[PDB]
Amino acid sequence: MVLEYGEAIAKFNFNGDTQVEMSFRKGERITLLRQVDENWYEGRIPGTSRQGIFPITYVDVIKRPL
Amino acid sequence: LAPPKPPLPE
């Protein structure tokens, strides 16, 4: 359903505890693939296979997915 | 130090 991916830069360190979650450090640029629910994005690290979900509150949203 | 982790999606 998404027509344009978004992007964000991490503003907090996030340790995912499960396979569905994507860990990252402050400063990592993340492509936003979709908003999963009220609290989580699915994203990916550009040029890689790191993909999974993380909390919206842990990133600075530059562009929302459309 | 970070915001509390929200509950996971369904």
Question: Which domains, and CATH codes, for chain A?
Answer: 1-66 (2.30.30.40)
Method: X-ray
The count of other CB atoms within 10 Å of the CB of residue A41 is 25
The Cα A22–Cα A54 span in angstroms is: 6
Count of CB pairs separated by less than 8 Å, A with B: 25
A36 touches chain B (CB under 8 A): yes
Smallest CA-to-CA distance from A65 within A27, A49, A40 is with A40
Q: What's the residue count for chain B?
A: 10
B4 to chain A, minimum CA–CA distance in Å?
9
Resolution (A): 1.0
Look-up of token digits 């569905």: A20
